[PDB]
């Protein structure tokens, strides 16, 4: 059925079969992984707000 | 077909990479020629032979 | 002619493309045709 959004997560990518994740099925695949250094400064900002940079 | 006494039935076979356009082929075809499409899954757990038939 | 070197560019950089992904990098690119002709090398594995 047409309009329809379809959200998909799994820990370890290699195990998917590359059918079930194709140019049509998936249409944009994104990797989330550890962090960075802007993300700790984000996060220590988000957290402890008032704080000098 | 009547007159040679062959069945008149036909099948057709479709075989390819995943997303090489196989699906979205029938139904284009399924359109151009008016007609409808009845899915039929074959590793189901209701399907019998007679079913089948 | 854009056309042609849209494809001549993606025969270039992979050998085995298919048009699901060609679609799918057309989506990328909505009302751009310059954009798609120009980032071929996005499409190399
Ligand atoms: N020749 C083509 N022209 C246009 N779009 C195409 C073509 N081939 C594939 N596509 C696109 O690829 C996507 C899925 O295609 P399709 O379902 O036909 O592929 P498939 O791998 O044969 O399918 P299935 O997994 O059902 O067997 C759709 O977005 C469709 O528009
Ligand atoms: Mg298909």
Redesign the pocket.
Do not use: L, P
């Given at each position: 059925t047409e309009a329809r959004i379809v959200f998909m997560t799994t820990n370890y990518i290699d195990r998917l079969d590359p059918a079930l994740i194709r140019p049509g099925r998936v249409d944009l695949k994104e990797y989330v992984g550890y962090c960075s250094h802007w993300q700790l400064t984000q996060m220590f900002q988000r957290f402890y707000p008032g704080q000098a940079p | 077909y009547i007159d040679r006494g062959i069945p008149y039935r036909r099948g057709y076979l479709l075989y390819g990479p995943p997303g090489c356009?196989?699906?979205?082929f029938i139904t284009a075809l399924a359109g151009e020629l008016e007609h409808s499409i009845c899915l039929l899954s074959l590793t189901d757990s209701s399907l019998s032979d007679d079913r089948l038939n | 002619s854009l056309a042609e070197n849209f494809a001549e560019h993606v025969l270039k950089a992979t050998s085995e493309i298919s048009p699901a992904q060609v679609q799918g990098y057309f989506m990328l690119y909505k009302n751009d045709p310059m954009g798609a002709v120009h980032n071929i090398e996005s499409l190399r594995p």
């Open positions: - | 356009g196989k699906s979205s | -």
